[PDB]
């Protein structure tokens, strides 16, 4: 009797608490295909080459779609594609925005456009000589553009400010202050979903629409009270559009934090209890720094979240049998991956890096992260087959192009925690394409097993089909 | 024959009076997941570990998203976190709310506000010096707030109030007072759902949403009928969002209480035939006093009711069989649930007390409560299987985690009552991950069995896929 | 055992990065149809014959309904029907509209207007003798025709400018000018959907209808945000009205390209992986030069691709199974189809040429391209067959109309990328239809095996019920 | 093996161009029933009885409710029922609507209106003497009548008119012209769907409500852009209503013509691939003059298609597996139907005719049109059997009524082209209600086989339940 072993994801136990955890692979995606007898396969993330070199670590990555051209902010420099344009301060994570003659981008509580033509402009009220309001314009949080003007989210105070419309240097001379006030605070984060500005506060998500007004003094920005979610956001960075609205990670004052997707009026969870442990190890810090962004590339398309000690990719695209999570990583010891902020121009997607002054361009046909070895993980469910006594495992791997016979440790666990010897098999061979991977003899199998079948290598890795021989 | 056996929810009979009663779990909650031939898995509720010092029990908590926080009225004091902020006079169930300057509580018919500045002030009637409108303020019974007004029900005469918008110390100016009016009276409690104030009266539940009237005296709220449930509740805090509605336990006013989750002006019936009867058992006093909370923690969404004698869990993630009522109970003779006032911060569930003037932080790799042994139950619905013969009864739990080799009593009932002769294995080994708790030889089924599989540990318990070979 | 093997759709492995794409039929289209055992067939696109002389190669077509006959745009001729009636500069293509009064292509920045009395003029602005406003008319890049007025699209700058009523060769005196908007930038190209003029933008697509407002000065079309999809086009001619809404090819913008259907707000994604990566394989250039059309015949509903390597037919009526894709080539050597423009005019659907100045006209008893002989293939998806030693291989094909004993060579592949010895079976002989396409010994199978199953005609080629004898 | 061959649709191969086409019945009507191990049987179209003697082959007929009889316009007279009651001039198809007080007739560009007194008017522009307004009344296309006007369409420019309430021999005084104008041109046809004004063009179909406006000059009717159709239809007589919506043949317009039933702002396929094909088959010409009529009769809704070379009938009532055509004839060499112009008056159905100068009534019990022996038609599916020995091939016939034991040619081919020997078998007889239509031995299906079953008879023909014994 030959069995079929999935290997989309496993299950193993968390020995802190002795609780059944799933173990999701490590630097593959699922691609639900119908090949042969598989019905999907599995394929290694795409590897990263180095393409440009830049100022510092990445802290900003948008498409302009005026100069249809990608703008980064790496370092303290702003670059449009490989020219560096100007200059920005601060030090971390930054907002940027675009429009019909300038990128904005918000930095240390400050709203600074740089146009096209060469200035660096700054948000500020109007001067008192004209007789326009004059508002409290304090820090700046999170910033968006819709309608030909900038929205940008007051620090900490429930507020919001829309520049005007022939001015984006400063906000609008009658009514350009808006509020939530369906809470008692939460600004977190803001956005523009289809054409309403979206404001993510914590346990509450209002959206506001153009009410065409003509008097002056008169509120240009109503709230939309049948499409308020009742949840919030961890942190200003905690969101993203990801198919056709935002999927966000809930702030912690609505119960433990997870990942959601805005339906119509209300959230439907993403997160499995695997991921939600996960989220739930971090403090309120080091959650609140988390980045989401979105990614899309041959059907796939993927939500990464990156936390300080993670990056957890969920494929909507493979989600048939419940969601689709997968870890990324870079090296062998589960240090956090490298890449962040991808973005697609041309035809080619656009890596920054997190530790090194460096752009990479995301190739296809190496799995090596600037030219360094990788490593991908394949864990197996465990099942119960007492005495089961258990014979060739077989798996098919699409080999072919590599630079050297890269192997393949193959282990076995029997208490889903500890796993025992490692046999190292040849999963791929340089010009060859047709391997057979496959271990002829295996144990007896007392009351578990499961297994680990683990890659290091600089090549492309494509698995599919494990199976065994149970008798 | 190898048959499975559930444990989420046994059989029994109720010596009372001679009827079919649900067993309920004690302590462990149920949790869908393909484990291995089991397809659901059973665990111990994380057990709680003393972390502050209050100044008596628990009289209520509520997450200041103003001010990012948690606070916790315990005994006569208000805290902030760990640190008092304000003294509250009274010793019963009291109403929390917050707005962007204060904290108020509902407390002996008092809304007293705490402001973050250290100022104590009581809701009160406009100086008559004022040319304002004067009400008739009566006793404060429940408390609400929605956009920066605290709404507030007063004592049993089908009224409530408003604040005013630029003093939250006074009611309205012009006009502040509203009826439900569509019942003869019933004011029982309040809340706010979406962007409309829900007022629960006996029998009856209102909405009412903010008109937008600008001109002096005008009403500011108006009643939905079109979303009115025709169902009231119980008690002042028999009511709580769940998910995104609010579910409660009906009053008497409508027939036998049970518990109910609106819809669009519908309530859907959650409690089941036992849940029923135990809720029946007291009387509308000892219903009056119950409280109802809401916990979400590692994709569990439960639903607590505390009561005199019974402190009653559903999961709304576990009820695809029917509806997932767990027990929840403190000590080895049914003695009353010591937590109470979950609420879930930075990275940690914190809860209060029933008995003692402490608080917990609900540790997850611990089942015991302040370093006290708890005792878990798990039943098997009854059936028939006369002159059978049952073997190799297994049950497999995640062993690892303990202190001590602690056991499991393992008993059957051969009329649904009275269980047999009790007989101990060790289902746990301390850093032992495959145990096979199993018991060789089962005796004889004359007509009927059931099994009973009580545990007593300080460490979590994880159960699933209980089995016999029946022959 | 008799296994049958479906051609609909192969299966394969890339050389270039060792992943599993899909092969689609060359030169056939599956019909969907209960035959024999088969429930659907495979037919041979219908071959062009010559029928006009044209002065160049194409640049665009359309059917003019007022005059009921074809225009086509040839070189530096513009012909109604055969007849040339008038001239057209530039080299590339030219965008196409008609009305009551004239026949408007937009070409070279202006919108040319050929009228049915025989004179020719152009869109300009109002003399400014007369008090009519002025605006600034740049150059072009699409127009439409819709309600009688010619909708005219400004080169990068987001607006687009609307005709007069009454005078065609003038925009409207008093509001003429529109905008997007809700967008960054982009107005790419536009449409008219039912009665709304559409403009697809990068990343975005608005939908415009008229007000109805009398008035002098106002507004005669409104936007509506409803109908909105938060996606762009790649190109100006990325588009087609497909069924009843537009097929396009979305922008790199909003990430990697593919082909998209709108629906009701939203954008259907259509391209499978493998038809995405041929996409993502060009550049932003020639991609963004890149043509859409539609054909229509024998219940067909052909999107029609052409792309500077790769012309794509995407099947609407066989699409039960999910996307059916075709590839069609001209030669034996892969390249680049040269029917273009297609449209069904009297009872024949007349086409153009991409390389001469030729016009045909799809005969569809022959199969040849200008009397030139073209190559079909039908891959047939991989598939584990250990040790199969398989016999029989059958395919039914209906014959009889061939000029010559026509050939096919049948040659398998054991790996997905390398194919070995080519065997020649007559799969037609001229009037005889009763011919059993048949191969009697397929050697023994190792691992895998894939059929080609190449044919090289003149005349038609229809196959079906692919089987073998596996024992 | 007994299996049962079906008989509603049989399959054959096209040689000129070898495709795979469906083989309709002709004069067969399938009746959904459950007979005998059947379900369904096919019943031979009713044959035609000689009535009336009138002036010429019919032109036009329409059930009058206001006289509650039919008007016929056959040759140069026309008929209110079977009595001459006017005058027509002209040789082709006429338009027929009817009033309260008129019967008008769309014929030669003009609408000729034939009142109930005796008085034969013509619509026309009030005279200049008169203050009400002169329009440019072109030609007359096709007429309809709704709400006491008379509407008709201008020939060939886009524009429709309502003639006066009070004066039906002139249009309205102030408002009678309406444009279509969301459209290049084409005013084709004209109708009314309920109360909505439907006209039909070259790729558009629109709808024109009552505007309910009372002063005058203001427009009657508006256009209703939320229910219009993107489709044409060929001619002006390519449309009638056929259950609840119009059933049409699109215009070559918008690609290949077919036949459609609009829906609710999409029009529904009807046609086949192989009745695509018959349609394609003519010319823009020779499918202007296809003329669709509708009938209904036993639970049969028949829509009825009249071209130069084919009459085709859909049957809506028996389109449970797909959509039922047949093929009606007169005579044994595939003549067109001479029957025309079907319309049921007290209990019988009463048609015209296409060449004699003669009216029938559709009598059931017999099968001959005008006592001429008629020829019936009933392929069977091509079907693989290989090596397969056919014997006992039964039908279950219904007889009884006939004046001669007619006989039936069987026949088999073995290439869907051409058939074999024909074999004569008594398959009815007078007075005799159990025959067994039954042929014993047939021959050895080398590879495949295909039956013609052909009846010539002047009596109904009953046929169901086709099996044969395959061994």
């Given at each position: 009797?030959?069995?079929?072993?999935?290997?989309?994801?496993?299950?193993?136990k968390?020995?802190?608490?002795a609780?059944?955890?799933?173990?999701?692979?490590?630097?593959?995606?699922?691609?639900?295909?119908?090949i042969?007898?598989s019905?999907?396969?599995?394929?290694?993330?795409?590897?990263?080459t180095?393409?440009?070199?830049?100022?510092?670590?990445?802290?900003?990555?948008?498409?302009?779609?005026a100069?249809?051209?990608?703008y980064?902010?790496?370092?303290?420099?702003?670059?449009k594609?490989?020219?560096?344009?100007?200059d920005?301060?601060?030090?971390?994570?930054?907002?940027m925005?675009?429009?019909?003659?300038?990128?904005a981008?918000?930095?240390?509580?400050?709203?600074?456009?740089?146009?096209?033509?060469?200035?660096?402009?700054?948000?500020?009220?109007?001067?008192?000589?004209?007789?326009?309001?004059?508002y409290?314009?304090?820090?700046?949080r999170?910033?968006?553009?819709?309608?030909?003007?900038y929205a940008?989210?007051?620090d900490?105070?429930?507020?919001?400010?829309?520049?005007?419309?022939?001015?984006?240097?400063?906000?609008?001379?009658?009514?350009?202050?808006?509020?939530?006030?369906?809470?008692?605070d939460?600004?977190?984060?803001?956005?523009?979903?289809?054409?309403?500005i979206?404001?993510?506060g914590?346990?509450?998500?209002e959206?506001?629409?153009?009410t065409?007004?003509?008097?002056?003094?008169?509120?240009?920005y109503?709230?939309?009270?049948?499409?308020?979610?009742?949840?919030?956001?961890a942190?200003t960075?905690?969101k993203?559009?990801?198919?056709d609205?935002?999927?966000?990670?809930s702030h912690?004052a609505?119960?433990?934090?997870?990942?959601?997707?805005i339906?119509?009026?209300?959230?439907?969870?993403?997160?499995?209890?695997?991921?939600?442990?996960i989220?739930?190890?971090?403090?309120?810090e080091?959650?609140?720094?988390?980045?989401?962004?979105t990614?899309?590339?041959?059907?796939?398309?993927?939500?990464?979240?990156?936390?300080?000690?993670?990056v957890?990719?969920?494929?909507?695209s493979?989600?048939?049998?419940?969601?689709?999570w997968?870890?990324?990583?870079?090296?062998?010891?589960?240090?956090?991956?490298?890449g962040?902020?991808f973005?697609?121009?041309?035809?080619?997607?656009?890596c920054?890096?997190?530790?090194?002054?460096?752009?990479?361009?995301?190739?296809?046909?190496?799995?090596?992260?600037?030219?360094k070895?990788?490593?991908?993980?394949?864990?197996?469910?465990?099942?119960?087959?007492?005495?089961?006594?258990?014979?060739?495992?077989?798996?098919?791997?699409?080999?072919?192009?590599?630079?050297?016979?890269?192997?393949?440790?193959?282990?076995?666990?029997?208490?889903?925690?500890?796993?025992?010897?490692?046999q190292?098999?040849?999963?791929?061979?340089?010009?060859?394409?047709?391997?057979?991977?496959?271990?002829?003899?295996?144990?007896?199998?007392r009351?578990?097993?499961?297994?680990?079948?683990?890659?290091?290598?600089?090549?492309?890795?494509?698995l599919?089909?494990?199976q065994?021989?149970?008798?």
């Open positions: 009797p030959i069995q079929q072993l999935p290997m989309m994801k496993g299950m193993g968390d020995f802190k608490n609780d059944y955890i799933d173990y999701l692979p490590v630097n593959m995606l699922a691609t639900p295909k119908e042969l007898n019905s999907g396969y599995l394929r290694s993330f795409p590897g990263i180095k393409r440009y070199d830049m100022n510092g670590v990445s802290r900003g990555v948008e498409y302009n779609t100069q249809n051209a990608v980064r902010v790496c370092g303290g420099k702003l670059y594609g490989e020219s560096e344009v100007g920005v301060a601060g030090s971390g994570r930054v907002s925005a675009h429009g019909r003659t300038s990128q981008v918000g930095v240390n509580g400050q709203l600074v456009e740089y146009r096209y033509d060469g200035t660096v402009k700054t948000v500020s009220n109007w001067p008192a000589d004209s007789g326009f309001t004059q409290e314009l304090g820090s700046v999170d910033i968006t553009r819709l309608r030909g003007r940008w989210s007051k900490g105070t429930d507020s919001w400010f829309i520049t005007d419309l022939e001015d984006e240097s400063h906000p609008d001379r009658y009514s350009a202050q808006y509020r939530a006030e369906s809470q008692p939460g600004i977190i984060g803001i956005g523009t979903w289809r054409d309403f979206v404001c993510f914590s346990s509450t998500i959206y506001f629409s153009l065409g007004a003509t008097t002056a003094g008169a509120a240009l109503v709230a939309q009270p049948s499409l308020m979610v009742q949840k919030g956001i942190g960075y905690c993203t559009p990801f198919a609205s935002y999927a966000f990670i912690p609505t119960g433990a934090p997870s990942v959601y997707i339906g119509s009026g209300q959230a439907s969870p993403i997160a499995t209890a695997s991921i939600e442990k989220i739930r190890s971090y403090t309120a080091e959650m609140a720094t988390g980045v989401m962004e990614l899309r590339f041959d059907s796939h398309e993927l939500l990464i979240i990156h936390l300080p000690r993670h957890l990719v969920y494929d909507a493979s989600s048939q049998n419940g969601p689709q997968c870890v990324l990583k870079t090296g062998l010891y589960d240090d956090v991956y490298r962040v902020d973005m697609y121009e041309g035809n080619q997607i656009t920054g890096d997190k530790s090194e002054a460096v752009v990479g361009q995301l190739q296809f046909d190496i799995s090596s992260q600037y030219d070895q990788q490593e991908h993980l394949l864990f197996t469910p465990l099942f119960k087959a007492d005495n089961a006594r258990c014979f060739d495992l077989e798996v098919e791997s699409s080999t072919g192009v590599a630079q050297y016979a890269d192997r393949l440790f193959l282990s076995a666990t029997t208490d889903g925690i500890n796993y025992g010897r490692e190292m098999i040849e999963q791929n061979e340089p010009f060859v394409y047709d391997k057979r991977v496959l271990w002829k003899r295996v144990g007896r199998i009351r578990l097993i499961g297994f680990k079948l683990r890659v290091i290598t600089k090549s492309p890795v494509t599919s089909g494990c065994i021989r149970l008798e």
